[PDB]
Amino acid sequence: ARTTPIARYRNIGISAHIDAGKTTTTERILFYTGVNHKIGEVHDGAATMDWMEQEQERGITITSAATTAFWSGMAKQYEPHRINIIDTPGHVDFTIEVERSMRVLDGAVMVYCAVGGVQPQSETVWRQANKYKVPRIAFVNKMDRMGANFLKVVNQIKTRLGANPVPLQLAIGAEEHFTGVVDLVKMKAINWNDADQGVTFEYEDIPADMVELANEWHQNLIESAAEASEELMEKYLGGEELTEAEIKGALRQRVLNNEIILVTCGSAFKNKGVQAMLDAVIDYLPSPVDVPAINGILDDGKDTPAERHASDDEPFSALAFKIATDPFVGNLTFFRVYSGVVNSGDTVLNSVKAARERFGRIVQMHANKREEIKEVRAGDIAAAIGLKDVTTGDTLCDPDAPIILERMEFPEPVISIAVEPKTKADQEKMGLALGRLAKEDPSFRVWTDEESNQTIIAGMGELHLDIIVDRMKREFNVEANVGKPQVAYRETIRQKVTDVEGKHAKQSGGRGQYGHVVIDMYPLEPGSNPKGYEFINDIKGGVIPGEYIPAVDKGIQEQLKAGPLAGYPVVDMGIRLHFGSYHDVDSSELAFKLAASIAFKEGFKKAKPVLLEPIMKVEVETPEENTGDVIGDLSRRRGMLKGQESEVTGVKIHAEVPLSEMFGYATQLRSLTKGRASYTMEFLKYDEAPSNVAQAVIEARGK
Amino acid sequence: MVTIRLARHGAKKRPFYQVVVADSRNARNGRFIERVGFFNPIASEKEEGTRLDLDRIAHWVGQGATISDRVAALIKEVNKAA
Amino acid sequence: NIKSAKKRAIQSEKARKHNASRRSMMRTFIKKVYAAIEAGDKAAAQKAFNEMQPIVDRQAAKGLIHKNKAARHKANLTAQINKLA
Amino acid sequence: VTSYIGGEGHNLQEHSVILIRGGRVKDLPGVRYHTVRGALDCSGVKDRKQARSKYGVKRPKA
Amino acid sequence: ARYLGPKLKLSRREGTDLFLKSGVRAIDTKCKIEQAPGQHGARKPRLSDYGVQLREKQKVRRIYGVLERQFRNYYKEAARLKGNTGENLLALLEGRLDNVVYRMGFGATRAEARQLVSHKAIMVNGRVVNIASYQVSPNDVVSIREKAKKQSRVKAALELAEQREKPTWLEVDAGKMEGTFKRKPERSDLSADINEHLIVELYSK
RNA sequence: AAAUUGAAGAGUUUGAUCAUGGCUCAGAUUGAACGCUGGCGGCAGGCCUAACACAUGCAAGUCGAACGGUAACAGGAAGAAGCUUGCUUCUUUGCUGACGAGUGGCGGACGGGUGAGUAAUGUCUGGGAAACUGCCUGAUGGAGGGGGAUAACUACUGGAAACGGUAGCUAAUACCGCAUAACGUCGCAAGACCAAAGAGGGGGACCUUCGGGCCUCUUGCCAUCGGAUGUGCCCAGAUGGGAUUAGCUAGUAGGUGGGGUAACGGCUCACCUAGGCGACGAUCCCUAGCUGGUCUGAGAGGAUGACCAGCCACACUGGAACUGAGACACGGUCCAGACUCCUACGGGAGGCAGCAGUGGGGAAUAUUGCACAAUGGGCGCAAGCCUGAUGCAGCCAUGCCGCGUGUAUGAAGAAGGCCUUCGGGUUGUAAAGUACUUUCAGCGGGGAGGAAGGGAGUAAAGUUAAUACCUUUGCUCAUUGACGUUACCCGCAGAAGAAGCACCGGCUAACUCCGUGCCAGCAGCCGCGGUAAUACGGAGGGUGCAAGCGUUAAUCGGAAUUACUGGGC
């Protein structure tokens, strides 16, 4: 049956700040397990994790692509394990890729730089890991570089993110004296070989230049591991050290229970430390079943409605966590089999999307190459082909219903612009690619606009939309030249009512019959009637026909929606009507409506409404380093501001800003605070401002 | 090798084969040098729900043809010993 | 190739070498006889004919040429030989 | 070639796609093609209640 | 597919009595059956040649409940048959299982008779036929399939079944609820109110 | 006995008529498209354009009863791990089942897709001689005897990946020569020459090198003449338009000779003749697969090649041949050109017009589905394997047919709409009400047929020399269905869960009001609308058709409007 027992699976995630070396370490791992020759780099694009040709050229990993191998811990290089790495990107623009990946792994090796320690994006993915208690260890990449330290990085992780890091390694040599790693469990120092030949280890003796500090952090690791359970404390208290195996199991339980984070060092570029990091992957990260059993739920929520676990006998129950765009077969859906066994062509009931699906093929991955395989079992990541109804986050299972998996969460985009192809004939050929992209990615929302005929889209940064626009030009060969979204001005009178009439009749020569009504233009204050239109009747002279009074309000409705100022729907407006003329015959409401048209268009313009501009309620949460700076930028924009409250990890600041100005505000916001600010933009009120941009529509049509 | 097989004329979920003498090259419904008798496997009361043409079948199998399994069984039947 | 036609291509090439060899022997002897004919030496011609006749008959029976081809050959050569007088 | 635009009130700019069906106009000179109302953003005539299939109007619910 | 809607509208537009409603009480006491259903029936339309042709064909169609489709086929066959095409058309129209059911009773009108024939509550010579267009052959018992009795609507219909001519082709037992089909009903065995030659010329136009 | 019993007209030039005369209309039909709407079921249909480029999964294998043998699985033998000499498994051992890879034999040239090419190298009709023909069949014989490799392999070396070498062997139905063969080939004869393979099943006699031999039987091989199937070739006739296309052709036409093809042939070569085609249309040009038939027509006729079937040509484009019975070969070869993919940079792989599916074009046409259970087909002795042929399924009202969306009752003619002569008319028995039923779809239960066959056990003769092996015929036993929750039957509650579209001026079947005023608009022709619109739009009401309705496109008819039947100057 299955090629390996479950305990040989290690579903690990690689995620960190940008450029911290995720892809380099992943390629080194692939080489050191032997599915890749020619270790390769990224700045020359030849790496195999990078295929989309954007990360070939631009040398930035943009999307996660799972990959598997056979590296081993028991008599390493033998007794193979199954390490499923997922090379996730670390960009704040692509944090959605981290989100869904971090929600689908059972562990993940976090990467830290020895130059800067943690970085704002790492503090972000730390929240995205605590969000799911994903067990995790640290890999201090880039020790080989100038000014790189190890203990400082350890202190950084200890102090800033709030965790407890324990050294599983100590480094021999800082910048270019880095020649290998000394350990605190094996207590022997490894000196890797020369360039691209770091496959070997050459176990060697610990040099005396570091023996004392090695001993210090060794005993510290010893006591911190014994902290796991009582029977490890007293044995140590008796004047006896624990041994490798029980220290390893105890720390491993700490990682299972998400109490600790282990740090390993290395330099994925000088080909040092990669194997010793794989050592930690094996020795401490939970296997699929070592993790607590998945919380499955029936169509109703309980404590244990569907107790599922990784088994060949358990029902097929998995989480479709990633879609991908494939031109050939339409889509390509990743899925991580939490429990059970499923085969090619077999059935599956989309428990969430309320349908049955089928697996045209099931392909496991080599970062792009879709390996054709018969079946996939528990703990084994795979990509399903052909299933139509499913999207991200959905749950795929047998008819026995572990229907509810816990998550349906994804962030809200912050940047928005509009797009337009070579000509307005290809608009459906553009919206089609947009639909594919919006079904592939949750945060990226294609936003058909109703006020104008433009197609605006929303992403989480200048870079994310930039890959999307090129990926659109590249994969879907329709180039779209971009611009800003149009503004959403509006109309309403200040306070004053003005008496006005409009007169014209029809039948002087025997024609059809007429209409005539007197109106007075009263507004309400912005936000008075929640229904944008409020009416009070006062007809007493020339009483319009009994089936025509409501149609008078419904005809001034047209004039409201018309908005004789610049075409804009007049809001909170009110009209009061007094006079008219009628007979007990069949008059025409349309003439009363045109009559009311002339009346509206004159009396409004002379009652002097206001031409408002969209003003948004803003909330921004940013650390206390650049509160003054971000507030300064906001005030330079149009700063209307709400208040100030100190959160645990920052400050609570809300404000009021024009939608005519907030367009590219996201990149500037993050650039003003190193990207440690959180914020959402939503509407509060419409309002006026002295601006000579107020005549664009008036120029296109109207007064 | 002039096989004598069944041709599967008729309709969906309603077979009505046709005894044909044809080259074993051509298709099932394909070219044949002659057809000899019909066969229907859901005929409740029709012409025996089966018929062969023993004179012409003898002509062919004597001059050097062969016989498929269904046509052979149908002749085993029409020869009323069983 | 993608199918078990590779074995067939290999067997066909082997048979190509071999049938080329046998055909070449046949035509070598036929050119022998045709030289003997264009020369004028009748006894030599009939000798060459008897030298080639068993070869070509064996070959036709091997199927490299067809019985009609072997018979046509022997007929051509016998006729022109008895004309050589 | 040319094309009529039936019904009351259209929304066809300089680059909007439309469908063309046969049938001349018998009074407009040289126009021999009715624009199929209600297909490919050449949306149907608004506020119709009789003969909606031709002229492309969604059946009102009521 | 069945004509849904008002019935006396049809009978009154066609003016003549077509028996759409149960022949229980009367027709002109319930509907003012002389004028069109429209508010403009007080006017006398002129009804030129094609008017009378369409009216005749629509009369026979509303009597028998068959629609223009399958009616064009009831012309196709019964023209394919040798002999008078109009008379063969009336023959196949009479042989329809619903028509024979109603004419032997079991249902006071063609609509009740079709509801019966379609509700799997009849048995042409032993076999449950749920096909309101089953063309019945001569020498066929109709065998109303007991447990299709004891509902009192078929009984009331069998009661009302008399005061009507016992048709010279039916020979309904009338009490064991069966009926032979001696021979195909003649054209002369019918009302002679309906000009079948009108329908023939209408369709051969 | 039946093989047909089958031919319609109108609007429209004029003040008005008649006639020629064209435009349009009612009809039938469609691989259809789109708008509106849309319940089910059965059966059929589904890339007409871009023969445009194609990701991926499959679309051709089989045979141990041909061979060497042992890659994997086991039946296995002897053991001293395991171990209670094993029921608690170590290996040598193809010894047997079975079989990776290899040799070999058969298939792959079938089945399937497309219509680019093709105006005649074709197709169809009817004949002909100058031939071939595996597997299939009738008949007649032979089935000595031996050797040389070579694969697999082994060793070594490349492939720093894929993908190949240098030597050493060893088998076969692989291959080669001698023996022999004639009504076979050549030859007038005289005369000469020609081939082959063995395997499997059983066992009484008797010799053995337990290998067997041997007498059997089942298969197989070679040769030769027939049968049949398929196939090659030839001829006469028909098989689109354009003469704004009048000449065209040197292997061109033929004679002779040589060669070649399986076969006859300027198929080819070499002479020699100067001929040959042509107004019955040569040549050139455009276009096109042909046909059985399909749509139409009363018939002649017109248009056409969707489905199913026969023929042909083609398989990225151009060219060539190799094996073969059969190819100049879709999933074979080789070369040139384009393209694509892999490359470790030294190279290498591929051909969806196969089924699915993508992208592009389009207005437009389906799942990356289920199984060999039937039929088949290849191989096999058979079980048995392959089968995107096939049988089924999924999508879509694409079409044809059937069915229901309730049935009866009901004058307070309810309300209310609309009209109005102001009394009422009509919606209208229509709904409401009342009773009856449950088709269909939804649940629940029950349940045909498509299933022939083949396995084991058995008997009768048949076989021999053996009643053994094996055909072959019965017999009993377990069984082989994808569809599939089949069709279908019966029960369950309720009338619920199911009607729309177009038209209403004449042609045409169906009329009034309000709203518009040559504006908005309608329209197939005639035309309507410039204040009383049955012609626009809405309302009411009606007429048609009804899971369709309408529009468009398209062929034909009506068109006696290319008139041969059937017209005119």
Ligand SMILES: Nc1nc2c(ncn2[C@@H]2O[C@H](COP(=O)(O)OP(=O)(O)O)[C@@H](O)[C@H]2O)c(=O)[nH]1
């Ligand atoms: N010095 C040093 N440079 C590194 C290391 N890892 C990655 N880099 C450099 O970082 C650049 C991009 O690395 P990349 O794989 O894109 O990091 P990622 O973006 O987190 O995957 C390259 O130029 C590498 O040379 C390291 O361990 N040491």
